Design an enzyme around this catalytic site. Structure first.
Site, PDB file in Angstrom:
ATOM      1  N   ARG A 167       0.233  -0.996  -0.160  1.00 32.57           N
ATOM      2  CA  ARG A 167       0.374  -0.164   0.083  1.00 32.57           C
ATOM      3  C   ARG A 167       0.693   1.285   0.196  1.00 32.57           C
ATOM      4  O   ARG A 167       2.141   1.010   0.042  1.00 32.57           O
ATOM      5  CB  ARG A 167      -0.865  -0.208   0.710  1.00 32.57           C
ATOM      6  CG  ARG A 167       0.141   0.172   2.336  1.00 32.57           C
ATOM      7  CD  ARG A 167      -0.897   0.548   3.900  1.00 32.57           C
ATOM      8  NE  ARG A 167      -0.299  -0.198   5.260  1.00 32.57           N
ATOM      9  CZ  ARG A 167      -1.528   0.632   6.222  1.00 32.57           C
ATOM     10  NH1 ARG A 167      -1.764   1.109   6.142  1.00 32.57           N
ATOM     11  NH2 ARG A 167      -0.042   0.939   7.024  1.00 32.57           N
ATOM     12  N   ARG A 172      -8.104   5.050   0.463  1.00 34.72           N
ATOM     13  CA  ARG A 172      -6.523   5.124  -0.425  1.00 34.72           C
ATOM     14  C   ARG A 172      -5.792   4.278  -1.289  1.00 34.72           C
ATOM     15  O   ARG A 172      -5.270   4.833  -2.111  1.00 34.72           O
ATOM     16  CB  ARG A 172      -5.961   5.931   0.856  1.00 34.72           C
ATOM     17  CG  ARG A 172      -5.022   6.905   1.027  1.00 34.72           C
ATOM     18  CD  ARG A 172      -3.178   6.082   0.112  1.00 34.72           C
ATOM     19  NE  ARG A 172      -2.722   4.900   1.144  1.00 34.72           N
ATOM     20  CZ  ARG A 172      -2.909   3.906   1.862  1.00 34.72           C
ATOM     21  NH1 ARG A 172      -4.236   3.158   1.837  1.00 34.72           N
ATOM     22  NH2 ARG A 172      -2.771   3.449   3.077  1.00 34.72           N
ATOM     23  N   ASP A 225     -11.060  -4.227   7.761  1.00 37.65           N
ATOM     24  CA  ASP A 225     -11.342  -4.136   9.229  1.00 37.65           C
ATOM     25  C   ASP A 225     -12.035  -5.398   8.920  1.00 37.65           C
ATOM     26  O   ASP A 225     -12.890  -5.012   8.305  1.00 37.65           O
ATOM     27  CB  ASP A 225     -10.929  -2.840   9.841  1.00 37.65           C
ATOM     28  CG  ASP A 225     -10.422  -1.478   8.935  1.00 37.65           C
ATOM     29  OD1 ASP A 225      -8.852  -2.286   9.669  1.00 37.65           O
ATOM     30  OD2 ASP A 225     -10.500  -0.653   8.124  1.00 37.65           O
ATOM     31  N   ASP A 232      -7.634  -1.045   2.669  1.00 30.18           N
ATOM     32  CA  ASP A 232      -7.853  -1.249   4.474  1.00 30.18           C
ATOM     33  C   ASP A 232      -9.305  -1.997   4.617  1.00 30.18           C
ATOM     34  O   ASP A 232     -10.152  -2.090   4.442  1.00 30.18           O
ATOM     35  CB  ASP A 232      -8.640   0.304   4.714  1.00 30.18           C
ATOM     36  CG  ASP A 232      -9.479   0.216   4.398  1.00 30.18           C
ATOM     37  OD1 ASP A 232     -10.049   0.831   3.339  1.00 30.18           O
ATOM     38  OD2 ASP A 232     -10.149   1.288   5.206  1.00 30.18           O
TER      39      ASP A 232
END
Length: 158
Positions: free
Chosen positions: A82, A92, A97, A95
């Site tokens: 990343r 971005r 989660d 990600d």
């Protein structure tokens, strides 16, 4: 226990990221991917540049600690290479989660049990609706029930 995670990608080929984002779970300790949703295009929410953005959930049948599970999915972002720089609210680059995990409710430093945000978003309820909509909270509510009040059929595929 199933791991309801939400993957994102923008500044690094939204398609390339997802590939090694859902398969990397196969190597994750005590983690075994079961069902996989599809690719849905939708606008992100954060810094980056808010481009096409691709989102896709996945029901990771894992028994790994609820606190270290998300911790694993985090190091996956690093393995994916990343481009950290300004990630506060938007993907971005990548990600993933824990948006939902069994029924337990634990909150460590990096791990975050069903974060109070997915229930008010579409790229977290709609995708999860495919991986496993039979998930229920300790009190008595399912992501399907959440979609009954939300009704988020958007997230038009790529």
């Amino acid at each position: 226990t199933v791991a309801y995670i939400a993957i994102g990608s923008n500044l690094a080929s939204p398609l390339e990221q997802v590939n090694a984002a859902l398969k990397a779970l196969g190597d994750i300790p005590e983690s075994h991917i079961l069902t996989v949703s599809s690719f849905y295009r939708t606008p992100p929410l954060g810094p980056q540049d808010q481009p096409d953005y691709l989102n896709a959930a996945v029901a990771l049948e894992t028994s790994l600690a609820p606190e270290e599970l998300l911790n694993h999915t985090q190091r996956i972002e690093l393995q994916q290479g990343r481009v950290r720089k300004a990630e506060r609210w938007g993907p971005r680059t990548l990600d993933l989660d824990i948006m939902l995990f069994g029924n337990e409710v634990i909150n460590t430093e990096r791990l975050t049990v069903p974060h109070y945000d997915m229930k008010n978003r579409g790229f977290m309820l709609w995708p999860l609706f495919e991986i496993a909509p039979e998930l229920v909270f300790p009190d008595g509510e399912m992501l399907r029930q959440i979609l009954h009040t939300r009704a988020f059929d958007k997230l038009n595929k790529w």
